[PDB]
């Protein structure tokens with residue numbers, strides 16, 4: 156938290172708003188396979204700009220996810236809308252993982268994210284790994300410009316869901332005192348947080364038999380390591396898609412004596428692995444060692460065979 | 476809000492009388508309710524540690540039967556009956572006097588009640604009740620704040636109070652979570668408690684029960700009208716090496732399914748099939764349960780049937796409420 160980082164944060168914040176002020180059309184993108192924080196940061200920024208600058212044309216684009224559609228509706232726009240437009244990307248550490256490839260077809264590109272800065276693809280890169288979520292960064296932006304009063308029910312609701320998504324509702328280690336203070340203020344806007352959380356947690360009945368496979372086929376070792384391996388034949392047995400299977404990475408997290416676990420889904424020509432750890436244990440390092448990365452307690456790796464998975468395992472078990 | 480400020484003013488006099496009693500007594504003993512929850516532990520130990528930190532020379536004790544699931548929160552004190560002579564007794568989180576754990580609570584010279592449940596039984600000499608608080612732990616924090624002692628809070632105080640707030644809010648999920656609740660929990664996290672570690676310890680589950688939850692997830696039957704049934708045969712209990720009572724704690728495993736309105740979780744113990752009946756919103760199912768020889772509350776009832784053929788009639792009866 157050096158004094159220089161802080162000064163650069165203020166300047167970056169100020170620069171972003173000038174880019175917003177100087178642009179009539181603002182288009183906001185997020186990552187493929189969106190989560191609540193993706194939807195909440197994108198839409199929250201959209202609604203914030205729309206409230207502060209009611210003449211500007213602000214759009215939120217990408218492929219909609221039916222599980223998240225309750226958060227808000229996305230915009231379908233023409234390729235011409237991008238001409239001399241400001242493009243902002245939320246929540247996306249790597250440019251290949253952005254959901255619409257037109258993010259580069261504009262005059263300016265801004266990145267706002269809370270993942271370690273490894274791909275500085277913006278002309279402006281706002282990165283704060285000390286934030287719980289990109290949603291929380293968006294509220295920090297609002298607070299910087301003393302606009303906390305323009306926050307209405309819509310902004311507060313989508314930003315609240317985004318913080319909740321990335322903290323597991325204030326559970327994970329990325330929840331700070333600042334995180335709780337923001338979420339308190341958001342609830343202050345009468346958003347009926349219980350109703351929102353109930354909607355977000357509601358389950359598609361057709362996915363539950365697969366979740367039961369996880370509960371019955373997890374492998375916990377006395378070491379504190381656990382593994383769940385989903386083969387291509389399993390996804391076929393249950394009629395589910397690999398992104399759908401990935402949403403069950405934390406199904407086993409409450410097991411007594413759990414320390415490190417990996418959730419591996421063979422997506423065909425690539426096994427997507429979600430690496431998770433308890434406490435101050437570190438897995439982000441082993442993730443980078445295999446071409447992956449993310450948070451030290453929540454990172455992702457892809458391998459190309461089950462023999463290479465076993466190496467991801469062995470390496471992870473050395474960390475105790 | 477204006478209304479909230481008025482509510483805080485009504486309690487100020489009570490807060491100051493509790494503290495005077497605390498100051499006036501060198502021995503202070505704190506009780507909570509039988510079958511304790513996180514909030515019961517956290518409010519009792521929170522207040523104990525607060526008094527111990529503000530008055531290091533007083534003798535402050537937290538009594539009651541320990542619960543193995545919650546003992547990580549803090550250890551309870553074991554005292555002889557004579558310790559209550561001319562002592563101050565405080566009871567936290569306990570609406571009704573028959574539910575105070577240790578009966579020695581009346582053996583002292585003063586009784587104080589601190590609680591957040593509806594004031595139906597004002598069993599204390601002094602009674603502090605705030606139904607607008609999320610939890611008794613949140614009331615304890617408000618007391619600390621009223622006497623400008625927020626800096627006296629240490630890791631012990633913040634940890635136990637945080638767990639008590641988390642317990643009665645479902646970790647900031649229920650409607651009793653206010654903005655003020657969130658703000659307090661923030662301040663508590665600011666005392667460098669390891670909240671994820673504390674929570675992990677609280678949510679800790681037995682790996683043996685996970686397989687059976689999976690069966691439940693692979694053998695529920697949702698109908699288009701929103702009715703859902705889980706039928707557990709006695710052979711299944713044997714397969715997963717579980718007991719009928721254990722198996723009944725999975726009644727709400729499917730409660731988050733989209734479209735769900737009424738469900739029944741039915742377990743075949745050799746003698747009878749024990750059915751747990753549940754409903755969403757304003758749907759009533761306890762009239763149906765009464766019709767088949769059981770009963771309970773409108774949204775949560777139980778009935779025993781003697782055959783799966785009787786189960787089907789119970790089911791058919793339940794669905795008449797969905798039409």
Ligand SMILES: [Mg+2]
Nearest residue numbers: 192246289321
């Ligand atoms: Mg995120």
Ligand SMILES: [Mg+2]
Nearest residue numbers: 190192193246
């Ligand atoms: Mg995300």
Ligand SMILES: [Mg+2]
Nearest residue numbers: 514568611643
């Ligand atoms: Mg309570």
Ligand SMILES: [Mg+2]
Nearest residue numbers: 512514515568
């Ligand atoms: Mg209680």
